[PDB]
Design a protein around this ligand. Structure first.
Ligand SMILES: Nc1ncnc2c1ncn2[C@@H]1O[C@H](COP(=O)(O)O)[C@@H](O)[C@H]1O
Ligand SMILES: [Mg+2]
Ligand SMILES: [Mg+2]
Length: 354
């Protein structure tokens, strides 16, 4: 089920994963001409746009009518900037086609050739769908955790397919994820551009070194019994979640181990069974989480046997509400239900105690 879509997603993320891994230090050193500030003061770089261009152009070459909700827009980009996006794509093509070309797979075609600056603008702007309750659409965060990317640390390339408001397929590239950093083993070929994790609803969750992406290894959450032995997953950026209220949850549950890292790589480590609880409580309750920050991990965690809800009500996340989630905060865990509900009710109590 969804065979073609899974192959398209996997290769699109794979090619964008090599580009963003390759760019990381060039964008950092040259963080005066490749980094733009958006209306909410968040950063956007040549990497974010190049990854969006590669993945939407692969989607459209294979599925010409498909709808895409992508984070970025080309509005306002100068020609000079868009020439830099094209150049990075072509430079990545020269490295990528030497080693990793996939037989019988097209990233571009006659209709969407990805040759000109106008092609780049058009492709980026096919990500302007607003989502919603009915029908099939793609959901894309080209670089999830751009601040992690700019710190030379973790970031992810995230794509999902949503159908009738439910995530059916997810694919997350984590180009800089080294599993030895945590407590685990790294697989053959992980060093060039990290790992790809993926899942289709009902068919399990799997991963592979990005450079391979042919041999897939099944993953599953772990099942620890005592919260005192568990490990939390939290972001690094203090403005993305309430770290002090997450510390209160940890103290109440006697949790003393925590991993901080940017992006939906966090969901991948939960799905691999390397940590137990992802916490993301909101500092301000007016914030609405973007669907592209959670859709790919939602199906991956579900298929790995975990649970995924908001941070207060303990209800499933609804990916049919448009570009954002109407609930407050996000919490995911290895389950079971008793563990998950203990974490979420503790979160609701801490938030209500403000
Ligand atoms: N005020 C905020 N609250 C929650 N998430 C945010 C906020 N500002 C930006 N983000 C998201 O944080 C995501 C990365 O999450 P993370 O790396 O886990 O901290 C980005 O893709 C942004 O959409
Ligand atoms: Mg951004
Ligand atoms: Mg992003």
């Amino acid at each position: 089920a969804l065979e073609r879509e899974l192959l398209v997603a996997t290769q699109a993320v794979r090619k964008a994963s090599l580009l963003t891994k390759r760019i990381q230090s060039e964008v950092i050193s040259h963080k005066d001409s490749t980094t733009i500030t958006k209306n909410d003061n968040s950063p956007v770089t040549t990497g974010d746009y190049a990854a969006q261009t590669i993945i939407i152009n692969a989607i459209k070459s294979n599925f010409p009518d498909d709808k895409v909700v992508g984070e970025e827009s080309s509005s306002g980009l100068s020609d000079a900037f868009v020439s830099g996006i094209l150049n990075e794509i072509k430079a990545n093509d020269e490295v990528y086609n030497k080693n990793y070309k996939k037989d019988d797979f097209l990233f571009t075609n006659d209709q969407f050739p990805l040759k000109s600056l106008e092609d780049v603008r058009q492709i980026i702007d096919f990500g302007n769908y607003e989502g919603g309750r009915k029908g099939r659409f793609w959901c894309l965060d080209p670089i999830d955790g751009t601040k992690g990317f700019l710190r030379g640390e973790q970031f992810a390339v995230c794509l999902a397919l949503i159908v009738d408001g439910v995530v059916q397929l997810g694919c997350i590239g984590c180009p800089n994820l080294v599993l030895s950093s945590y407590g685990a083993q790294d697989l053959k070929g992980h060093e060039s551009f990290g790992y790809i994790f993926r899942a289709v609803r009902g068919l399990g969750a799997f991963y592979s070194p990005s450079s391979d992406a042919e041999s897939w290894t099944k993953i599953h959450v772990r099942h620890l019994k005592d919260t005192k032995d568990m490990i939390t997953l939290e972001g690094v950026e203090k403005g993305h979640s309430s770290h002090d209220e997450q510390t209160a949850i940890k103290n109440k549950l006697n949790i003393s181990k925590s991993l901080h890292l940017d992006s939906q790589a966090k969901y991948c480590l939960l799905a691999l069974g390397l940590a137990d609880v992802y916490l993301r409580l909101p500092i301000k309750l007016s914030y609405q989480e973007k669907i592209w920050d959670h859709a790919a991990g939602n199906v991956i965690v579900h298929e790995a046997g975990g649970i995924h809800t908001d941070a207060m009500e303990d209800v499933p996340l609804d990916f049919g509400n448009g570009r954002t989630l109407a609930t407050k905060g996000v919490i995911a865990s290895s389950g079971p239900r008793e563990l998950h509900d203990l974490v979420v009710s503790t979160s609701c109590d801490v938030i209500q105690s403000r």
